[PDB]
Ligand binder design. Structure first.
Ligand code: HEM
Ligand SMILES: O=C(Cc1ccccc1Cl)Nc1cc(C(F)(F)F)ccc1-n1ccnc1
Length: 461
């Protein structure tokens, strides 16, 4: 019924099929589909996810208008993605006045001052990582980076969100470690999410059946655990994401007990695989380019002599490490996309955007577009050198998004990732094993993950 919207506005795009739109074009994934449409349609094109029209914009000025300028007025919320249950109070899922209240009451939790107080806690499990890394290195066999980084990210999440101190690699039995290990990213091209994308009318049916997109067993366990910790913390009468929220609940509007639980889980969901996935991507690019690995290891030793422990100020000093992280995020933006919902009829940069249309920014396509990048398929971390760090457009390179709805944990994630990278590199060096796919291929699903898990030879330095 709504498949003729983009034709009447003179907007190019793939011709849609009845009842499906262009979901069949997802056979290569969102990343490949967006890049092909960028080459075959220019700067602005459109497509349909079932009956939902999606407009893709690549003009940096338009991206600025959608994400920053007209964010509060028009482009405020993301598209609904399925039955959420009580998790509708999550900040990433909240909409309109609920989101603005929640972000205002949660912004101080991610301050630079509070982050400097969280560095020592994250540093403790960096030493835990190298201990398990040494045993894996002494074996003489290749090591999958997803598991060692997942154990590290899980350890950081448990100690930052709560007061739980666990070695996940050697103790995969605590209830925190078990349930949280199932908090993986959403494959939006799997049979379930594909079915709800074509059948959005089934989302309310799933909600009334108490069928939540998140595992119900994990959510109920975590909610009860917070209730146990909230009472136990009172009996003990701190640097915790929970404690910072508790210190805000007692002193816009207030924050509810169920809201605090919902935001606590979303932090785990936002950090478990995302941190580990980027860490695996970073180490793979260092192994195949040892010149970058050598210079980064030399820079780490210069700022931190004699294998010194990292500090908040020292992490921000290391420049080449920031270049490695940024360039890897350019090649692999694990979000792959940025989406906003147009809540009203509006014209942006001389273009009419009707209400209800989802506006999408192809982060992966822009990050590998030749117009803004030279040899985009190569791992050249020098693109972000201080002299060359200004030529890049901040709205073509959006790994953490932009505007008031960007990643609220960008500073925490960058510090957590960099703290791990300093410790592992100054003690270990990584070489490509035989099982490593030198031309590593990306998965064809809804996740920006490699086709095969990255395996790399590891040795003591
Ligand atoms: C490597 C790790 C991470 C990456 C690459 C990443 C990237 C992103 C991206 C691309 C967005 C979308 C922003 C946009 O729509 O404009 C986002 C949103 C968000 N992220 Fe992250 N993120 C990471 C980790 C985290 C962590 C660990 C937390 C929590 C402690 C977090 C909290 C959030 C929140 C709350 C939002 C939604 C903000 C809003 O709705 O106002 N992120 N992130
Ligand atoms: O916004 C993203 C985009 C993204 C970012 C990185 C990797 C993959 C992806 Cl797809 N994901 C996300 C979604 C939700 C929810 F509840 F709406 F489903 C909650 C939290 C996050 N999140 C992840 C990282 N930081 C925040």
């Amino acid at each position: 019924h709504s498949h003729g919207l983009f034709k009447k506005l003179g907007i190019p795009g793939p011709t849609p099929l009845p009842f499906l739109g262009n979901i069949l074009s997802y056979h290569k994934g969102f990343c490949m589909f967006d890049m092909e449409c960028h080459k075959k349609y220019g700067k602005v094109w459109g497509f349909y996810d079932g009956q939902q029209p999606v407009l893709a914009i690549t003009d940096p000025d338009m991206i600025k208008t959608v994400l920053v300028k007209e964010c509060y007025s028009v482009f405020t919320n993301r598209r609904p993605f399925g039955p959420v249950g009580f998790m509708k109070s999550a900040i990433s899922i909240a909409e309109d006045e609920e989101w603005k209240r929640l972000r205002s009451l949660l912004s101080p939790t991610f301050t630079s001052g509070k982050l400097k107080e969280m560095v020592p806690i994250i540093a403790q499990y960096g030493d835990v990582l190298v201990r398990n890394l040494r045993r894996e290195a002494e074996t003489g066999k290749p090591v999958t980076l997803k598991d060692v980084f997942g154990a590290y990210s899980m350890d950081v999440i448990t100690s930052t969100s709560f007061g739980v101190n666990i070695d996940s690699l050697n103790n995969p039995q605590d209830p925190f470690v078990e349930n949280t290990k199932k908090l993986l990213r959403f494959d939006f091209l799997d049979p379930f999410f594909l079915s709800i994308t074509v059948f959005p009318f089934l989302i309310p049916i799933l909600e009334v059946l108490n069928i939540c997109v998140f595992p119900r067993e994990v959510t109920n366990f975590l909610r009860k655990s917070v209730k146990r910790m909230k009472e136990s913390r009172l009996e003990d009468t701190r640097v915790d994401f929970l404690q910072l929220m508790i210190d805000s609940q007692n002193s816009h509007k207030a924050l509810s007990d169920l809201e605090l639980v919902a935001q606590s889980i979303i932090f785990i969901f936002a950090g478990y695989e995302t941190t580990s996935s980027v860490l695996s991507f970073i180490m793979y690019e260092l192994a195949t380019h040892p010149d970058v690995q050598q210079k980064l290891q030399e820079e780490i030793d210069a700022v931190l002599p004699n294998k010194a422990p990292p500090t908040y100020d020292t992490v921000l000093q290391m420049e080449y490490l920031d270049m490695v992280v940024n360039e890897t995020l350019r090649l692999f933006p694990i979000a792959m996309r940025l989406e906003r919902v147009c809540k009203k009829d509006v014209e942006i940069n001389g273009m009419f955007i009707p209400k209800g249309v989802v506006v999408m920014i192809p982060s992966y396509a822009l990050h590998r577009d030749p117009k803004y990048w030279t040899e985009p398929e190569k791992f050249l971390p020098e693109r972000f050198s201080k002299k060359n760090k200004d030529n890049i457009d901040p709205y073509i390179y959006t790994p953490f998004g932009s505007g008031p709805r960007n990643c609220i944990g960008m500073r925490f994630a960058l510090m957590n990732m960099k703290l791990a990278l300093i410790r592992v590199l100054q003690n270990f060096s990584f070489k490509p094993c035989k099982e490593t796919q030198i031309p590593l291929k990306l998965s064809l699903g809804g996740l920006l993950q490699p086709e095969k898990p990255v395996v790399l030879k590891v040795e003591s330095r």
